[PDB]
Amino acid sequence: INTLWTGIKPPPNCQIVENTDTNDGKLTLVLVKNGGLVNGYVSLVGVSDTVNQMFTQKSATIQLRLYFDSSGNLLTDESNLKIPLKNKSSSSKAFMPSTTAYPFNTTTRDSENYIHGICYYMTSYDRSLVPLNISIMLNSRTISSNVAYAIQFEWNLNAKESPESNIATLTTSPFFFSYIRED
Amino acid sequence: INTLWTGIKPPPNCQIVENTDTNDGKLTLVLVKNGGLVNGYVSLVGVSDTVNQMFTQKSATIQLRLYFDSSGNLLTDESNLKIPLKNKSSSSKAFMPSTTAYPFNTTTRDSENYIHGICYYMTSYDRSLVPLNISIMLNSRTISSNVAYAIQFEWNLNAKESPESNIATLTTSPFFFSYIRED
Amino acid sequence: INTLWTGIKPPPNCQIVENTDTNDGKLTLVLVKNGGLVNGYVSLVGVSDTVNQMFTQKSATIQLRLYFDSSGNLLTDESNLKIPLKNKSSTSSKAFMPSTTAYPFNTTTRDSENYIHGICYYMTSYDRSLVPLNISIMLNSRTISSNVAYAIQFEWNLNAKESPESNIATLTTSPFFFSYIRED
Ligand code: NA
Ligand code: NA
Numbered sequence A, B: 001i002n003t004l005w006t007g008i009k010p011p012p013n014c015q016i017v018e019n020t021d022t023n024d025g026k027l028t029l030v031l032v033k034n035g036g037l038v039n040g041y042v043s044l045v046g047v048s049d050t051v052n053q054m055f056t057q058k059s060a061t062i063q064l065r066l067y068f069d070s071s072g073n074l075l076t077d078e079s080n081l082k083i084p085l086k087n088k089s090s091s092s093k094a095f096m097p098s099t100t101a102y103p104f105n106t107t108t109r110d111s112e113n114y115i116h117g118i119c120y121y122m123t124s125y126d127r128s129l130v131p132l133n134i135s136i137m138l139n140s141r142t143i144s145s146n147v148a149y150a151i152q153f154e155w156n157l158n159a160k161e162s163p164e165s166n167i168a169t170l171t172t173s174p175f176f177f178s179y180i181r182e183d
Numbered sequence C: 001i002n003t004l005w006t007g008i009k010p011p012p013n014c015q016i017v018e019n020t021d022t023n024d025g026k027l028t029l030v031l032v033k034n035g036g037l038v039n040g041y042v043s044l045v046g047v048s049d050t051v052n053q054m055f056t057q058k059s060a061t062i063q064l065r066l067y068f069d070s071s072g073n074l075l076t077d078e079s080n081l082k083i084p085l086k087n088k089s090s091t092s093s094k095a096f097m098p099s100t101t102a103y104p105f106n107t108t109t110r111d112s113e114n115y116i117h118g119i120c121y122y123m124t125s126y127d128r129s130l131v132p133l134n135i136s137i138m139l140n141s142r143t144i145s146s147n148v149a150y151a152i153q154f155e156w157n158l159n160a161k162e163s164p165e166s167n168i169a170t171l172t173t174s175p176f177f178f179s180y181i182r183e184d
Helices: A051-056 B051-056 C051-056
Strands: A003-005 A025-036 A037-046 A060-068 A114-122 A129-138 A149-157 A171-180 B003-005 B025-034 B037-046 B060-066 B114-122 B129-136 B149-158 B173-180 C001-004 C027-034 C039-044 C061-069 C117-124 C130-139 C150-159 C172-181
Touching: A003 B173, A037 A051, A037 A149, A037 B037, A037 B173, A037 C039, A051 A060, A051 C039, A114 B114, A114 C117, A114 C172, A129 A171, A171 B114, A171 B173, A171 C039, A171 C172, B025 B051, B037 B051, B037 B149, B037 C039, B051 B060, B114 C117, B129 B173, B173 C117, B173 C172, C039 C150, C051 C061, C130 C172
Parallel strands: none
Antiparallel strands: A003 A025, A025 A037, A037 A171, A060 A149, A114 A129, A114 A171, A129 A149, B003 B025, B025 B037, B037 B173, B060 B149, B114 B129, B114 B173, B129 B149, C001 C027, C027 C039, C039 C172, C061 C150, C117 C130, C117 C172, C130 C150
């Protein structure tokens, strides 16, 4: 009982664009209990035409907010992820980011709640690697009384010229991370 | 049984140069089962004069292709790694990259099969850090029907000027990665 | 018992400025036994005014050297970390140490293989711009006492075209993740 995840190769399970009716992204997320940490793995594939045209511009931003109740279960209504996580062979509380290490803030000082790094996009044409700034915010903000934990992923494209000129499957190469886990 | 590796500080065990008669590199590779993922660690040391003069130019590329049969055992003839992996204390299928998450491709779009990142080379003179693009291709391609799994490492040097002007031990700083594992 | 760490959100527990009287930094370090490796997590928060003005310049360097005896216990006098590590569950920490075979103590200057290299980030107080910090971890390689059996050295380097801050601000380094081959 070490793994909390989206399952492998999930059907569209999340909503990237502001007001969309349909899930427009496939989020792959794996969380593994490893002593006092969680080991993490995250990658994203775009589904809708709107998502898959975002890299038609030189800048772009994708944000997925996940909120969990006190039992560590996904709050579907509030979250961008619309399908609950599950165990690999089956109180997901033990997978959650620690509220001590990453507390909810009553001010804008929040630097210690962030993980920062880089993953990559492969262009469709010549297969160039385009850097994407990835930041993960742990807890920090809350939007309702039902929220006990939170994980926010944000990818940023910031290039001198657009990676694509036409529609193409948006993919983000896997990003690896750890954080101090709850209880 | 939770570790599959080359052993610590192995002898020359891999073949970087095409037609070489002798193993010309020491590959250190550690794969650890961690819930639904494998945690990986990989670094390379050059042995032959040819390898240790590659960084005498401003661009260079090193590619190690590992192929495994259906039991997760190294296919020595086909691979660049010439010495089979082993456990830390002594049954390798469970260490392999998942064929569901990283399938073999008959299309051309193998974007989702790649891990990308950066490690570093320390120059012999002032010990300045030179960036190396590292990409790991999981599965995707199979040269032979014996092959059930594959892991490919590729280091790229792409500098404005050559890191060295003479022979010097090629070393790549350890690169860390995870991937979704089989069964 | 798989975790050796500083505890969560520790008090000032290390010394960035060599010759200071008081602990001037909070080091968060987590080491987890994972088969043949240790999985690592490290981040730093500055405490003193001196530390929190370092990023007032365009270049800066922070070095923390940890030394351990043959039992894997912190040598407090020799180290920059002044508070001993402990297990998560509240007599060997040897199994958490960097392998002396994979990362040996040397007698010359050809020790590339003892180094881990990577990047973490500083968030500026002004517009929250991300400033890159070169992080390098040296395993073993060096002794400075008959009692040193293992060593871990963390070094952060700021090297920018202009200074991240113009005034005092809390120095923080975003978490850096690493693995190494562990002892026994
Ligand atoms: Na719920
Ligand atoms: Na709360």
